[PDB]
Design a protein around this ligand. Structure first.
Ligand SMILES: CNc1c(F)c(F)c(-c2cn([C@H]3[C@@H](O)[C@@H](CO)O[C@@H](Sc4ccc(C)cc4)[C@@H]3O)nn2)c(F)c1F
Length: 138
């Protein structure tokens, strides 16, 4: 029952072995979800489930630098379902963010923004009820 959009500070930025866990439930008739790992105004890693992009469900990932989006990375494996509870786990690895949903590996996103310790907030937004958002070291 957290407020959405939700800002989760990541003190000191991210680092390999940091695991971020998001628990929520997708709203009925959802259109989109977004996770935005931010370096100031830049978005180091945008993870964007789209429930209806031309009648397809797709996850779009990208980076925003100086207000410009970069090259999209797309994943048609789509583990979210309207109305249903989910778990997103984002593990920071040396070279990439590694994302699993409901305990199944989904995608990796190579670090474009390389100052990991400056990626010090995570925004969580979209068509969800947000239950919890937290981090730990593994
Ligand atoms: C309900 N909450 C919510 C919200 F309020 C939002 F504003 C966004 C959102 C989505 N985007 C963008 C982002 O997805 C990007 C990923 O490549 O694509 C662009 S299109 C585009 C334009 C130019 C180029 C060069 C490439 C692609 C999108 O505009 N920015 N904000 C969101 F995802 C949300 F879920």
């Amino acid at each position: 029952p957290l407020i959405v959009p939700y800002n989760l500070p990541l003190p000191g930025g991210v680092v390999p072995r940091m695991l971020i866990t998001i628990l929520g439930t997708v709203k009925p008739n959802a259109n989109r979800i977004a996770l935005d790992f931010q370096r100031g105004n830049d978005v180091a890693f945008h993870f964007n489930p789209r429930f209806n992009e031309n009648n397809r469900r797709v996850i779009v990932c990208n980076t925003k630098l100086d207000n410009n989006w970069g090259r999209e990375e797309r994943q048609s494996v789509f583990p979210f379902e309207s109305g249903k509870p989910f778990k997103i786990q984002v593990l920071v690895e040396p070279d990439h963010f590694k994302v699993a949903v409901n305990d199944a590996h989904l995608l990796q996103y190579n670090h474009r923004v390389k100052k990991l310790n400056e990626i010090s907030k995570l925004g969580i937004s979209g068509d969800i009820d947000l239950t919890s958002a937290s981090y730990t070291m593994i």
